[PDB]
Design an enzyme around this catalytic site. Structure first.
Site, PDB file in Angstrom:
ATOM      1  N   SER B 143      13.948  -5.821  55.419  1.00  0.00           N
ATOM      2  CA  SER B 143      13.820  -7.549  56.514  1.00  0.00           C
ATOM      3  C   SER B 143      13.703  -8.019  57.503  1.00  0.00           C
ATOM      4  CB  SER B 143      14.934  -7.181  55.497  1.00  0.00           C
ATOM      5  OG  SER B 143      16.100  -9.303  55.924  1.00  0.00           O
ATOM      6  N   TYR B 157      24.267  -6.550  55.430  1.00  0.00           N
ATOM      7  CA  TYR B 157      23.483  -6.254  54.717  1.00  0.00           C
ATOM      8  C   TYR B 157      21.693  -5.858  56.196  1.00  0.00           C
ATOM      9  CZ  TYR B 157      18.588  -7.234  52.950  1.00  0.00           C
ATOM     10  OH  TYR B 157      16.965  -7.989  52.330  1.00  0.00           O
ATOM     11  N   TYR B 202      21.283 -18.987  55.764  1.00  0.00           N
ATOM     12  CA  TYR B 202      19.903 -18.750  57.004  1.00  0.00           C
ATOM     13  C   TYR B 202      19.561 -19.712  57.597  1.00  0.00           C
ATOM     14  CZ  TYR B 202      19.029 -14.745  53.454  1.00  0.00           C
ATOM     15  OH  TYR B 202      18.813 -13.322  53.247  1.00  0.00           O
TER      16      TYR B 202
END
Ligand SMILES: [Cl-]
Ligand SMILES: [Cl-]
Ligand SMILES: [Cl-]
Ligand SMILES: [Cl-]
Lengths: 260, 260
Positions: B143, B157, B202
């Site tokens: 990611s 994450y 985000y």
């Protein structure tokens, strides 16, 4: 106030029963901190570290925990705060090494490594955030193998520490709400009584050399032509957890004497 | 031989029931591969992907697996090889997102994320190594949050994917013994039907914007002023798994249209 010193501060150090953690615990004591010497196994060994810190003029207590068990991390931090009144600094030296080609890595071995190196360290950081005084310090342990050194048959361990590097960068964001900095140290080749049992894994055809040859080769990997020692890691941890280290935050410092 | 094409090759793609994985599966079919469409949940959805690949002129089969359960990864790969005769390419799009401040992350949430994103992907790579033909390809999913983008409240994450970045670098060493390359893709902001449910996480004060505003802001993060799409990831996966991608090995490619 004496610059660089930790007078009046309280530090908790995990992994105090192996070389690096023991050196970090003693060094934070030498700098003036009272120290919770956390350890995984030998109580007699941990009490030798306590005794060394007391001999230096700083208070210490040994508190055991299985860092794989999150309820034990919770209790460790509760007990630290109950004993010394508060906690300013938490350093994790918790981890285990592992070797093997990808093809042969088992479920059990994956879990053995990640439960301590990655999950355990994550929750040490969580409990440190929860318990720390404003303006405190968290330092976790990564490895030069996370990013800076590529060792065949070391994928599991390397990944366990790659996770830690990403954790600290983001922990620094969350922990800023208590003005706590979060960093990792990523040691290279560090000589301890356990180094000689694994040093063959780190060079091609390692088993064809003697332990002394392997240590010398390790020494020559740094352009300074010496081995890394537990005190080298302690020295950097001491800076990071001081007032003067504050502006280093969210970072991973590779401590390999310039090898990479 | 047509350059860039995968005629005569067999590919397995996990996570084929969400946007990116579905696009990767279809694209490898379009390039000429026969495709094992692996998926976690909806059989009807996976069969739509199979049907799309067949309509393009390439064979496909849907085979389900819970990638959290290593015995199921073993069976998935055994069944892939039994059905098509051999397997050349394995692409993992397996993962789940997670958000929350460090202080609130539970044991259960840690395990939910790492079991799939990190442990699951590790063992997909293990079984791919074990089953793949010489000269094959493994691609895992990292990611942009692993290293290139810092999102508060996204430590768990981000670390799950930091582990993957280190894994692929070392897997490339071990897997070279079968001439298999191993890489990861690290997508940025990719629009799918699940993007709008998490896009507020985000950006600062994300919930104060509409979904359309958040998508537009995401688009403007790339200097190309568009969103990333599942096809952007598929395009790069297609190159990595081709003959012409061989010299990219052990790497993580951030696919964010230049945002970082
Ligand atoms: Cl210990
Ligand atoms: Cl420990
Ligand atoms: Cl899926
Ligand atoms: Cl999956």
């Amino acid at each position: 106030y004496i610059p660089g010193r930790l007078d009046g501060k309280v530090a908790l150090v995990t992994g105090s029963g192996r070389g690096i953690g023991a050196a970090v615990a003693v060094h934070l004591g030498r700098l003036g901190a009272k120290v919770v010497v956390n350890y995984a196994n030998s109580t007699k060994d941990a009490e030798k570290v306590v005794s060394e810190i007391k001999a230096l003029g700083s208070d210490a207590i040994a508190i055991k925990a299985d860092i794989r068990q999150v309820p034990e991390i919770v209790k460790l931090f509760d007990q630290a705060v109950a004993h010394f009144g508060h906690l300013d600094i938490a350093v994790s030296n918790s981890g285990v090494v592992s070797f093997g080609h990808l093809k042969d890595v088992t479920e059990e071995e994956f879990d053995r490594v990640f439960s301590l190196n990655t999950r355990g360290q994550f929750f040490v950081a969580r409990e440190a955030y929860r318990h720390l005084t404003e303006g405190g310090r968290i330092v976790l342990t990564s490895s030069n193998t996370s990013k800076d050194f590529s060792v065949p048959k070391h994928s599991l361990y390397s990944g366990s520490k790659g996770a830690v590097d990403s954790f600290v960068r983001i922990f620094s964001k969350d922990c800023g709400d208590k003005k706590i900095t979060v960093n990792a140290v990523a040691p290279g080749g560090t000589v301890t009584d356990m180094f000689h049992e694994v040093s063959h894994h780190y060079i091609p055809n390692g088993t064809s050399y003697t332990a002394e040859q392997r240590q010398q080769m390790a020494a020559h990997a740094s352009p300074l032509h010496r081995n890394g020692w537990p005190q080298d890691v302690a020295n950097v941890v001491g800076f990071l957890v001081s007032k003067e280290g504050e502006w280093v935050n969210g970072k991973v410092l590779t401590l390999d004497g310039g090898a990479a």
